[PDB]
């Protein structure tokens, strides 16, 4: 169907494990959900403009390869996430 099964690379797995359960494979939906929770728990967003995330000083910044991004940049977020996993 439309569901996507994935296997996160080492660093993304570390990211995911800090807020969720360890699994051999995850769905893209699960990954997106956990990343949101990770960003929230670490308060990486701007309190006064919460659709803006600054990740340069965080593991997420190392994974995505950018200092910051807007939650509205869907293509960017999806492509950056795909660059950190393998589709099964």
């Amino acid at each position: 169907e439309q569901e996507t099964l994935v296997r996160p690379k080492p660093l993304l797995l570390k990211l995911l494990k800090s807020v969720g359960a360890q699994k051999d494979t995850y769905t893209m939906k699960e990954v997106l959900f956990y990343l949101g929770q990770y960003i929230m728990t670490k308060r990486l967003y701007d309190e006064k403009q919460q659709h803006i995330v600054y990740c340069s000083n965080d593991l997420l910044g190392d994974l995505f390869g950018v200092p910051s991004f807007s939650v509205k940049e869907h293509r960017k977020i999806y492509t950056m996430i795909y660059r950190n996993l393998v589709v099964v």
Partner: peptide
């Protein structure tokens, strides 16, 4: 409201 925006992905 971060979640409101994140829900859009």
């Amino acid at each position: 409201r971060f979640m409101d925006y994140w829900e859009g992905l």
